Design a protein around this ligand. Structure first.
Ligand SMILES: C[NH+](C)c1cc(NC(=O)CNC(C)(C)C)c(O)c2c1C[C@H]1C[C@H]3[C@H]([NH+](C)C)C(O)=C(C(N)=O)C(=O)[C@@]3(O)C(O)=C1C2=O
Ligand SMILES: [Mg+2]
Ligand SMILES: [Mg+2]
Ligand SMILES: [Mg+2]
Ligand SMILES: [Mg+2]
Ligand SMILES: [Mg+2]
Ligand SMILES: [Mg+2]
Ligand SMILES: [Mg+2]
Ligand SMILES: [Mg+2]
Ligand SMILES: [Mg+2]
Ligand SMILES: [Mg+2]
Ligand SMILES: [Mg+2]
Ligand SMILES: [Mg+2]
Ligand SMILES: [Mg+2]
Ligand SMILES: [Mg+2]
Ligand SMILES: [Mg+2]
Ligand SMILES: [Mg+2]
Ligand SMILES: [Mg+2]
Ligand SMILES: [Mg+2]
Ligand SMILES: [Mg+2]
Ligand SMILES: [Mg+2]
Ligand SMILES: [Mg+2]
Ligand SMILES: [Mg+2]
Ligand SMILES: [Mg+2]
Ligand SMILES: [Mg+2]
Ligand SMILES: [Mg+2]
Ligand SMILES: [Mg+2]
Ligand SMILES: [Mg+2]
Ligand SMILES: [Mg+2]
Ligand SMILES: [Mg+2]
Ligand SMILES: [Mg+2]
Ligand SMILES: [Mg+2]
Ligand SMILES: [Mg+2]
Ligand SMILES: [Mg+2]
Ligand SMILES: [Mg+2]
Ligand SMILES: [Mg+2]
Ligand SMILES: [Mg+2]
Ligand SMILES: [Mg+2]
Ligand SMILES: [Mg+2]
Ligand SMILES: [Mg+2]
Ligand SMILES: [Mg+2]
Ligand SMILES: [Mg+2]
Ligand SMILES: [Mg+2]
Ligand SMILES: [Mg+2]
Ligand SMILES: [Mg+2]
Ligand SMILES: [Mg+2]
Ligand SMILES: [Mg+2]
Ligand SMILES: [Mg+2]
Ligand SMILES: [Mg+2]
Ligand SMILES: [Mg+2]
Ligand SMILES: [Mg+2]
Ligand SMILES: [Mg+2]
Ligand SMILES: [Mg+2]
Lengths: 92, 120, 157, 94, 100
RNA sequence: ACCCCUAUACCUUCUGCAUAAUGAAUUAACUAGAAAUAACUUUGCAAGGAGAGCCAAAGCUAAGACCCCCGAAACCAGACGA
RNA sequence: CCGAGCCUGGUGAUAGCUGGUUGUCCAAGAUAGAAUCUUAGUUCAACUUUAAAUUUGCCCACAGAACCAAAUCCCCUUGUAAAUUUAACUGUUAGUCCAAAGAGGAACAGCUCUUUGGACACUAGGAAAAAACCUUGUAGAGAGAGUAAAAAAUUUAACACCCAUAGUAGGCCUAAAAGCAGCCACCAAUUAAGAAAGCGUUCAAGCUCAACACCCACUACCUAAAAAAUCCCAAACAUAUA
RNA sequence: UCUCUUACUUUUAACCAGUGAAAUUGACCUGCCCGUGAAGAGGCGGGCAUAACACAGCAAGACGAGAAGACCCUAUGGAGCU
RNA sequence: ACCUCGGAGCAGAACCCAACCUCCGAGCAGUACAUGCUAAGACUUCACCAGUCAAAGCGAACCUCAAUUGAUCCAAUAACUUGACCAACGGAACAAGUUACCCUAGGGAUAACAGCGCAAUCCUAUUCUAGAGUCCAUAUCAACAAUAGGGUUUACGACCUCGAUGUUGGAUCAGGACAUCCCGAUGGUGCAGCCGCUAUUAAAGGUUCGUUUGUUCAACGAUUAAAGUCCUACGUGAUCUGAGUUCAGACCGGAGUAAUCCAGGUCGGUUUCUAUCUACUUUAAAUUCCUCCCUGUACGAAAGGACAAGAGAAAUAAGGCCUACUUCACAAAGCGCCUUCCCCCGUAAAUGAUAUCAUCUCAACUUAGAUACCCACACCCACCCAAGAACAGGGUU
């Protein structure tokens, strides 16, 4: 039922990113939370790594755009600074 | 003789009907691509194997984020037959430092910043 | 093998699959459009002539009559001055229908023949007909009165 | 009764293969995926001139780290504790 | 003498029609070493506009030309460089008129 | 225990061996990688090193660590045989 | 076992040739070429391995590379992480099919020879078995799950009816050429028939077709095989919502 | 000799008693058809067949055993002869 | 035949790129006499060797060409320099034939047999309708050409096998295909009849004996209903043969100086196997000719001359058996005798729709259209047997 699960946004494998795989398997009977599971720890580390790449590539591109802007304004500044320093004489 | 392939530039000139079929906005392009490898590099040229290694898609079905910049798109265009490109969508915005530990990518292609594992 | 062979070469299976996937698909109509919904002017002048002139018009079924017989009968009726007009039905019938001697309409079916003349010399016509037994004298109309075969005979004696 | 001359799938005379439906539905599916790739690579966020140097520092510094490792190869330290600990292979109780 | 697909081999004319010529021309065509059809100006034009009408009317989203020129699925690994211009209508010396 | 499902001995040789290519009945024993020039590693001492000889524009001294087995048809010398 | 006895010795003759080559476990790893009494081998190169030193290596963009096709070279970005050099060596140097461009041969070969790229000499799944085709690669345990490639479709040939006199045996041409051996013309009478499209006459004579009438209407799917040798080869099934 | 072969005796033979080899042998729980495949299958695929086990006979197969092809090619291998 | 060097194509655009692939050339000539000296940086024939270009400088002045070539040692010479069609051109200082009298090591890396691939050649079918057939393509035959098959030849390839897959014919026993030689059924005929020709269907049954050749084959003699075409490791040598062919001896002619050789002939010349496994070892329905009769009938001008229906008489095959002959003799045999039974499909017709006629109909439809064997079963020590290798079987009243 993978295509149906994708159509509902719930991955395609039921062992993927849902509560059925990401909730803790057990807990102590008194009610204490169990130590975190190893696969879930690995998944959370990999998700942090992904999210940190999303922030970087966005901010590297969002920095390159403003660098391109701040360069074209300097080029148009050195194109608009066109005051003739001496004054035309001669046949005028 | 078998060589590399120059793909005409028209293929990447998109149509308004293409926009309504795959809703994306020509003005305001999307910034980051979720690229997943969905075919092998075996039975394929060595240069296509080299690009899959460069793009970091050695494992199949493992998603990678890349820039929607002209240079990366050129490489993804030599391997477009062995991959799936989707736009990375950001509903609640870019992750923050206080939110970087509760993210999930989801099959819709939507990096959500708050994962709770609780019914709505 | 070379790229050009004397026989149709066996393709690679992916190329076979490509051909099968890129075959032509004709447009299919939704509700099947099958299920969805001359000389006659000259001939008109000639029929206007045989009806606005000769007072006697006689219809006879055009029995087979081998050439010599067709020709001979014609020369005898020519003697008593009678014309053998053979004019088509697909022009003749609707003209009768709107030019008012429409009671001759259920009579001009099958092969037919007009024996017309200004002179009502019906007796000679009769003598001929009876020499050839397999001819009917279907009917006709003298002095604008529709008459049967027996009426023709009466207005004959 | 029906033998293909030689090996079946190589040569001048092969055993004929035909395309089933699922084989065509599989090829059609991969075609739709590739067409959606053609669209999402048709709207570049940046232009080449706009991206001409936006990653130069990160790439240069990464290669400097690679050079740092490949330069910092050297033999490991040796220890008198590591040498004298071998004397414990004759540590008797009494 | 090398003959390719789409070349007229003989031409006839005069105070005659296509039926008259078509009889013995189809006989000769049949005995020719390649596929061959007796054609007129009208029938040749009708064939070409029939092929154009079929190409415009095709309801298949996937054409050989599109897939081959875009290297969709990496299909140039089983195609030939001449197939980029032949577009799946030619396979060696054989022309396939039913392909669009 | 069988029945059920899955599974084309091994070695050598080769582009490729279930091959109907080689070898093998099996058991026990016997039966096949020898060293230099350098290099590298680890000690010693160090503009010198080595228990004469030799090397030395950081070397020299010492050590460690690498080079198989069976098989012709022949050739020659001296004896022994009608 | 005499094309040159036998025995001992040199002798552990020699063998670019065959055969053989002994504990465990991990790892990297598949071959452009040139010489050669050489092509059954070797040496150098290339590729491969280890250890060191250093800095760029692959992918690539405008610009750019000659007169008489696919592509490449060059190449900043960029995405990546390799590269070169120094030191030390072995081994491989008898290659197969597939796709593509060619060449030779028969536009033969499971044929031969080059080139670009796969794959195989490594795993697993599929294509019946299966090297070389497709899916897929990095290894363990599981009586969990989502998938990838992945199952051949086709069945063809009915075609009218009814009618026909005649200028003339058009001329020429001929033995005669009478619609019809050949040539020229191709008018003409009847409601409507070619100085005749096919057949048939030595020539004639004949009977069809095109024309009248007639009438519902030309109904008009435009397509096409079969052969070998032990014994056919899964069993079957047109109809319950992809 | 053959058409066209038959009969008998002796040897061999088979059964009983005594004595007791040889080549050969990867392991075998060792079937038929079609197909496949290093291109000719007991062992692979699809089908079929099938309780177990002696004795006699046969020679179609196990590319049956024997002899590291006598032919052909190669080897910077021999030898005889001219 | 080739072996070294260069240009062009293959190899279209940086480089590179093979074939006993397609073409063309070279093994110099001419000039000069600074064609002296030296020296940065480069190229490079995929290695090395070798080869190539070159600024600046000193000294003067004010090379063309495409290849046009040859290492080391050694030799010559006072020296500078100079020596190979070393052309097998990265060159051994200097060495040919022959071997069937042969030997060894290997090779299925490589030929001969067979298999396999392939189908040029070979064979067949169809399409096309020139032409032949008096006329008339299509009774029959058939060009130019087209489309398909087949796998019998001759080849081509070199994929299994050279630590052996033994061979030509013949014998024996044959399994199979049908593309049918005969026997059956049918359609056409340029079919009067008898004969034929040709096509459809049919593989149950059958398909002779001799002279010469080693002979397959072929010719010839005599028959026959006919004397098929093929496949099966050119079926089958652990069943046989050995004439040929394929070792060592010899002869003739030829080749060579000779040794020796001939894809020419000729005489002679060792054919092993005791069977382990697989498989197999008794599955009763016969065909064909001839004679007489039909009948000198049908048919035909005559000459000639049928098919059905009926009766017999054989031959072969299969199975059995001794009465008599014969080999023989309590019996086995053939040379003797007895028995032997179904169909068979190509087509030809009737009724009748699609298509109110007609039409044999991939319309519904109608017609031509097996029995027999065998069958009960701890009397069994033993004896006998027409039963039998052993075992089993029958009889013993
Ligand atoms: C069997 N015969 C016909 C034969 C044939 C060939 N080869 C050919 O003729 C060629 N055949 C081919 C082409 C290879 C198929 C042969 O080559 C031979 C022989 C015979 C042998 C005899 C050998 C024998 N020994 C080994 C038992 C012997 O006793 C002697 C002897 N003189 O003492 C031999 O001669 C013998 O060794 C030998 O030479 C033979 C063959 O060479
Ligand atoms: Mg095969
Ligand atoms: Mg043709
Ligand atoms: Mg071993
Ligand atoms: Mg081999
Ligand atoms: Mg084999
Ligand atoms: Mg074996
Ligand atoms: Mg083999
Ligand atoms: Mg062998
Ligand atoms: Mg061997
Ligand atoms: Mg042992
Ligand atoms: Mg010597
Ligand atoms: Mg004496
Ligand atoms: Mg002796
Ligand atoms: Mg040795
Ligand atoms: Mg490894
Ligand atoms: Mg040499
Ligand atoms: Mg050499
Ligand atoms: Mg060698
Ligand atoms: Mg994995
Ligand atoms: Mg005994
Ligand atoms: Mg053995
Ligand atoms: Mg196999
Ligand atoms: Mg088999
Ligand atoms: Mg076996
Ligand atoms: Mg036995
Ligand atoms: Mg053997
Ligand atoms: Mg040997
Ligand atoms: Mg030998
Ligand atoms: Mg050699
Ligand atoms: Mg020698
Ligand atoms: Mg020697
Ligand atoms: Mg070089
Ligand atoms: Mg200068
Ligand atoms: Mg040489
Ligand atoms: Mg040389
Ligand atoms: Mg001799
Ligand atoms: Mg071979
Ligand atoms: Mg052969
Ligand atoms: Mg004719
Ligand atoms: Mg061939
Ligand atoms: Mg080869
Ligand atoms: Mg052999
Ligand atoms: Mg063997
Ligand atoms: Mg037949
Ligand atoms: Mg044989
Ligand atoms: Mg045998
Ligand atoms: Mg024998
Ligand atoms: Mg010998
Ligand atoms: Mg004798
Ligand atoms: Mg066996
Ligand atoms: Mg009779
Ligand atoms: Mg009827």
């Amino acid at each position: 039922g993978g295509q149906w699960r994708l159509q509902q946004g719930l991955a395609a494998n039921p062992s993927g990113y849902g509560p059925l795989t990401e909730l803790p398997d057990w807990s102590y009977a008194d009610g204490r939370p169990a130590p975190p599971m190893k696969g879930q720890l690995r998944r959370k580390a990999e998700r942090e790594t992904f999210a940190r790449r999303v922030v970087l590539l966005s901010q590297e591109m969002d920095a390159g755009l403003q660098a391109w802007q701040l360069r074209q304004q300097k080029l148009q500044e050195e194109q608009r600074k066109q005051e003739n320093a001496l004054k035309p004489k001669g046949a005028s | 003789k078998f060589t590399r392939s120059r793909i005409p530039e028209k293929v990447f000139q998109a149509s308004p009907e293409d926009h309504e079929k795959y809703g994306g906005d020509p003005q305001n392009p999307h910034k980051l691509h979720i690229v997943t490898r969905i075919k092998s590099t075996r039975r394929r040229p060595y240069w296509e194997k080299d690009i899959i290694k460069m793009l970091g898609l050695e494992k199949a079905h493992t998603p990678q984020v890349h820039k929607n910049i002209p240079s990366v798109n050129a490489k993804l265009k030599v391997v477009k037959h062995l991959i799936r490109i989707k736009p990375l969508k950001l509903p609640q915005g870019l992750p923050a430092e206080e939110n970087m530990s509760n993210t999930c990518l989801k099959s819709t292609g939507e990096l959500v910043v708050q994962w709770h594992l609780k019914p709505v | 093998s070379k790229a050009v062979t004397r026989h149709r070469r066996v393709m690679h299976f992916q190329r076979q699959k490509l051909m099968a996937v890129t075959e032509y698909i004709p447009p299919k109509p939704a509700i099947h459009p099958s299920c969805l919904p001359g000389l006659i002017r000259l001939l008109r002048r000639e029929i206007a002539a045989v009806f606005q002139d000769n007072r006697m018009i006689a219809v006879c079924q055009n029995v087979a009559l081998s050439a010599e017989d067709k020709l001979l009968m014609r020369h005898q009726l020519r003697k008593h001055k009678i014309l053998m007009k053979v004019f088509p039905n697909q022009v003749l019938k609707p003209f009768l229908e709107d030019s008012k001697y429409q009671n001759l309409l259920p009579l001009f079916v099958g092969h037919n023949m007009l024996l017309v003349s200004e002179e009502p010399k019906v007796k000679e016509m009769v003598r001929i007909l009876r020499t050839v037994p397999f001819l009917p004298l279907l009917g006709g109309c003298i002095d604008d009165t529709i008459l049967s075969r027996q009426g023709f005979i009466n207005y004959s004696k | 009764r029906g033998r293909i001359p030689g090996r079946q799938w190589i040569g001048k005379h092969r055993r004929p293969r035909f395309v089933s439906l699922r084989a065509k539905q599989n090829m059609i599916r991969r075609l739709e995926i590739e067409a959606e790739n053609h669209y999402w690579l048709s709207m570049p966020y940046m232009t080449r001139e706009q991206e001409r140097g936006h990653a130069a520092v990160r790439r240069r510094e990464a290669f400097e780290a690679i050079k740092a490792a490949a330069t910092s190869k050297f033999p490991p330290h040796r220890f008198i504790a590591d040498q004298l600990d071998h004397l414990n292979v004759t540590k008797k109780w009494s | 003498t090398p003959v390719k697909a789409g070349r007229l081999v003989v031409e006839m004319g005069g105070r005659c029609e296509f039926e008259e010529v078509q009889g013995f021309l189809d006989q000769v065509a049949h005995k020719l070493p390649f596929a061959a059809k007796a054609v007129s100006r009208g029938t040749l034009e009708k064939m070409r506009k029939d092929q154009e009408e079929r190409e415009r009317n095709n309801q298949n989203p996937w054409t050989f030309e599109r897939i081959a020129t875009a290297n969709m699925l990496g299909i140039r690994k089983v195609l030939s460089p001449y197939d980029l211009t032949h577009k799946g209508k030619y396979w060696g010396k054989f022309y396939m008129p039913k392909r669009v």
